[PDB]
Amino acid sequence: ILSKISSFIGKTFSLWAALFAAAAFFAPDTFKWAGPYIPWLLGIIMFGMGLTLKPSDFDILFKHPKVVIIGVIAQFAIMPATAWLLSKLLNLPAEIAVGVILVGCCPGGTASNVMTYLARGNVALSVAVTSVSTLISPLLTPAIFLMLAGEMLEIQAAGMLMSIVKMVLLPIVLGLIVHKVLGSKTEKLTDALPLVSVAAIVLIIGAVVGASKGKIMESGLLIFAVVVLHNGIGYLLGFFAAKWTGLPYDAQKTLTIEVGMQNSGLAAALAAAHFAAAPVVAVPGALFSVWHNISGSLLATYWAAKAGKH
Ligand SMILES: CCCCCCCC/C=C/CCCCCCCC(=O)OC[C@@H](O)CO
Ligand code: NA
Ligand code: NA
Ligand code: NI
Numbered sequence: 594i595l596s597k598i599s600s601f602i603g604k605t606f607s608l609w610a611a612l613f614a615a616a617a618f619f620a621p622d623t624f625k626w627a628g629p630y631i632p633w634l635l636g637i638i639m640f641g642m643g644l645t646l647k648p649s650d651f652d653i654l655f656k657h658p659k660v661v662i663i664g665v666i667a668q669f670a671i672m673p674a675t676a677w678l679l680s681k682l683l684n685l686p687a688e689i690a691v692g693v694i695l696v697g698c699c700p701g702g703t704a705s706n707v708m709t710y711l712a713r714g715n716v717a718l719s720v721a722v723t724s725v726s727t728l729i730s731p732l733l734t735p736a737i738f739l740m741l742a743g744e745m746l747e748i749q750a751a752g753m754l755m756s757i758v759k760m761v762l763l764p765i766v767l768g769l770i771v772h773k774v775l776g777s778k779t780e781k782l783t784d785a786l787p788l789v790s791v792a793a794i795v796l797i798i799g800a801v802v803g804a805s806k807g808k809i810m811e812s813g814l815l816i817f818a819v820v821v822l823h824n825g826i827g828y829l830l831g832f833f834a835a836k837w838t839g840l841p842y843d844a845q846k847t848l849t850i851e852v853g854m855q856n857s858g859l860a861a862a863l864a865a866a867h868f869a870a871a872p873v874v875a876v877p878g879a880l881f882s883v884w885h886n887i888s889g890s891l892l893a894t895y896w897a898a899k900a901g902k903h
Pocket of ligand 1: 632635637640866
């Protein structure tokens, strides 16, 4: 029972998130109790990621490091640069540009693992690239964010590294330990992971939307269009990054999805933690978490149909 509702909730995530977002846009007091808990809500999500990691998920890293490295490089070369170029070309306000760049600087999101499966790409590659990007993000996300956004607002890069360590790295390590400890019984914790992760992230979105209602009223449509462009250009450059390195079609699909899909929950949590007096900074991350599941689903559905799915 717990499993099949998890799949339905997974397929309908953007609808649930959109309704919670609407509820927060008309009743901000609704989810403002969750604001202070955003880092912990993300911590739970990343704790779930650690519970599902296994040593065989890194077999491809030691057998085929170059393809994995290509994916990780494409992640941190395309999405931060794309966020900066969009911010400059569209002349976005500093607050919004910082939040868009912040999203672009985060690692990939584990949802890319599922979209890659649905798209019939290389799932082992998707899992490896997301895992590696995530584990090195405490160093790379602040470093790139500092370089691209440091002239817009004051950035405490070392402080953000420690935030990622506490919200990402330690929960993952706790998840790895708990799993090595529990062994096979861990399946009974991960049976709850999809619904818990969905509840946590919609709470983050609702808290972010409520705190920035006024800014969404004046800039909500602009931010949405930037997210669509940022996510979409990611797919495009990820695809051709794979094609021009000579990788096969299944890997092209994987890195398309890997690059365009982001750990946008982390971007929202970092903005809440470090830019709390500017709530709109977290809005790009919140919207990205919704849109990239819609866009990734459309892309995966398209590629599955091309691969012969009835
Ligand atoms: C369902 C399984 C339950 C297992 C629980 C494991 C979760 C462990 C996660 C820990 C992550 C905590 C790191 C969170 C610590 C950083 C929070 C912070 O300092 O920012 C200030 C905020 O209050 C601003 O809003
Ligand atoms: Na992935
Ligand atoms: Na990505
Ligand atoms: Ni048929």
